[PDB]
Nucleic acid binder design. Sequence first.
RNA 1: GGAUUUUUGGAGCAGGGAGAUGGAAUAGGAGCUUGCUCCGUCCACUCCACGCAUCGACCUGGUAUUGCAGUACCUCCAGGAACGGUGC
Lengths: 80, 167, 73, 95, 82, 162, 83, 81, 121
Amino acid sequence: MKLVRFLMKLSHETVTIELKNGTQVHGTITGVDVSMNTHLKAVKMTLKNREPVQLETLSIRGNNIRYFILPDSLPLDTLL
Amino acid sequence: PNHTIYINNMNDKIKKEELKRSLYALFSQFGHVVDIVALKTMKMRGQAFVIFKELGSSTNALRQLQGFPFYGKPMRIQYAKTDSDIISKMPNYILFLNNLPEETNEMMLSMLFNQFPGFKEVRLVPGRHDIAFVEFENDGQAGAARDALQGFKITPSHAMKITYAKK
Amino acid sequence: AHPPELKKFMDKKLSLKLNGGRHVQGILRGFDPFMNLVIDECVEMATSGQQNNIGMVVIRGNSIIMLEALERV
Amino acid sequence: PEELQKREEEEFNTGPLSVLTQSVKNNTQVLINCRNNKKLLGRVKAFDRHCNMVLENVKEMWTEVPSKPVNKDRYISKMFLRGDSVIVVLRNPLI
Amino acid sequence: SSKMLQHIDYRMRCILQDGRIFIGTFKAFDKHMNLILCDCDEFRKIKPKNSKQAEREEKRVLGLVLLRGENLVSMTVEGPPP
Amino acid sequence: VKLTAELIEQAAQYTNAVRDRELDLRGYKIPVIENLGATLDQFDAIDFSDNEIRKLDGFPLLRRLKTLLVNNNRICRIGEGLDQALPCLTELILTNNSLVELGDLDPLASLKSLTYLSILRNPVTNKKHYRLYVIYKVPQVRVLDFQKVKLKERQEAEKMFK
Amino acid sequence: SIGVPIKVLHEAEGHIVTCETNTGEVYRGKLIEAEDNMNCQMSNITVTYRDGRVAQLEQVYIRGSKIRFLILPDMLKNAPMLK
Amino acid sequence: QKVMVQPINLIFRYLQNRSRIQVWLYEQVNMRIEGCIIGFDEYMNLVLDDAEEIHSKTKSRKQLGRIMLKGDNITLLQSVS
Amino acid sequence: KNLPLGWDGKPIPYWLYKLHGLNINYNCEICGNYTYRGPKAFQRHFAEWRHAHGMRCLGIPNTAHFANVTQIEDAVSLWAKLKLQKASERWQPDTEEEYEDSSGNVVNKKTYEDLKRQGLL
RNA sequence: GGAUUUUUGGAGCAGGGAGAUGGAAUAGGAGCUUGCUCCGUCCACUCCACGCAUCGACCUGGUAUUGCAGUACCUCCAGGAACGGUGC
């Protein structure tokens, strides 16, 4: 097993992604595949020294992500 | 005629891209801009072509800009001998064509006669050679292109002129 | 699982750009499907014009993102 | 599948990732060391082969030069981490 | 799933390995997801190196570009489909 | 006749002649300059070939604009807030237009980005010292009547009319 | 499996293309031999090395691992991949 | 036509010689790894002996002994002895 | 159970449903991608309205010659050759009916009257 | 199917020195607000070593070509560096 499958427990889920180019974004992603592929939506994104740039349908990559933040009402053991 | 219009007689110390910007600004008016085929190699320097949406658009940019001042020398624009690769992949009603080729291809003759708002048909007199009679579904169109064709070049070895057919 | 097409270029001269901005001037001599092009008579070229003959460089495609040709082969 | 996940537990437990294995069976708050110099301190809730670890009570700190760098510090309790941005996963920090 | 397969054929700003945004009328995906961006351009920061000079972007167009899989940082939509 | 975002979205936003994003609306006689920003930050040229726009006005905030066709139009004057809505603007081609007097050159100078301009076929053309007024008011200009500007022309245009 | 990306690379090989690599090594020329691993062989190319002295070499072996992008035939816009 | 001389063939002949070479690195052409390789595997993750870091600009050499450098941060080597 | 209607609006029993073979559906592209159950039903539809409309808007009359041709490119190439044949077997006096001028050389009816009434013949 | 070509990453970072040179209205600390002193983020001018070279586009005037073809980019001399990344 992997925690890629734990991040596969995210759809209609309020998350926050700190990506590879100094990025930090709030996002309700669209759908995530086994290789971490989690496409953002209505997301407010800010790379290194940036603005709150908005993407209504965006496709955040895999290995070009760094950190993920799940919902607060998210049971961890039930999500993995 | 052609929708591909030749635009030349300008300076060479001007750039291809810069003269392209000038030509776009000055061509979106008299026609449409589809593509500017510009080569600044030596075999064709100081010249380019703009491929306009309509053949009458290109020849009308040619007849209005018949020597319009620009870029070091008054630029001259005419129709081309043929058309560009984009468009390649894509007073009366009746008038006698005098100096009508016994050699012309009816296809190009049709594109000539239908430069105007669509012509009715062209009838290259097949008896005693060197005559034709062309009718246009729009008589104003016939007279327009026939007056602008008085002395018109097609196969430049002659001038193909069409006047109002007599009584 | 497909070997690379250095086939007519083998035993011929290439001037390669590998990481560190470096250059390896040499003969195409040996490779694997890993593209590890190995250059004998290969010499380094640094940032400065200094160049040292390395004997036989087995230069991994791990870094070398370029290499140009000296002839037609 | 079955014997594979058996060997997988044995691998995460009696191999190199024993630090995170003890963070999971002992509920330790462990220092995941990024390759990008952002120190996150917290537990390990989900962990596997590639160093993919989900950390609870996560607190991220950076050396932020506005000067002499300050410790930019925040604490998002639950948050996941993939093992690519990680350089290390250390069981025990002195704090 | 193939999430982008709905949002393709429109002018989409694909993000770079170095932080550019390139609005190409995206075509298709892969397992590596290497991009084939048609009618595609690029634009990146023209860094003033200063503050009394301001930051802009000079326009570059490749047309149709085959962006190797190591490229994407994101893919958002910046133009509806023409 | 209503010129809407129907004719602005259905407009063609694609590769121009000089390989830039152009949005043509040829064949409408549109006299209404409204509902345009729905080009959605993916456009630099706004073209209204075959238009009857009562004057030069009515554009939205376009910090990107790189060409505009307002030729074959009914341009009589020139509106004010043009620069902050076209800072990237160099090509505002308004030939075959009907500008008349140099008071229609009042907002013409406030742009820092104007270099490729055309107001041809206007009664402001054959007037004496008209290109002089232009070469005075347009500092950063490079393409004027499709032939370069001149430092001699700039000397004349600054020195005269003190 | 097999990539319509690779079909695009095959339709972009053989003629003038313009690859762009990692550190700015951009080679505009005949991208002769590209294998689906993208190690592109270019021929009679003009490559900048991002150096602005974008000089013309012959038969370069520009890997595709560093390839940021690759400007392909503008005539195959109607590809069989997208159609 | 002509047969392949593997890079593993190079590394194997070098190790059989027990020879001292300096090796190149990644994203920093200033430093070189001066030492001898002891053994190998199918992976080409270079293992080394009595190695030292040698700097171009600084001009120093910091020795490790029997060190195990990364496999992906290798580029090539020059046999110095 | 999807059981088709009877006059008294109930399910049709199963052996009878099998006999009538409703399971089989016919993709009629002319009819707005309408799709039909029941084979003779399908067939009569070719003269039913939806097919008639389809035809009119296709630009080709609802004559029998195309009935059971349901794809529209086939229909247009069919009616294409049909058009060619109708124009063939028409006797058109313009190109057929032919006139000698006085000068011992011949033209058609059309050209004869043309140059006749534009002042020579 | 996280090991030398693409998706489990080599990413992060910092702008060379100084002059009784200066701006922080609404924003820094202490000397317990104002006045004034020193202190840990930039730009404008000037001194070095216009941070150093290449090339490309352009502005300047002179200067060669009148020519048909689908473009990385096509004159030559000379100035200036308004702009880009490549080696330190």
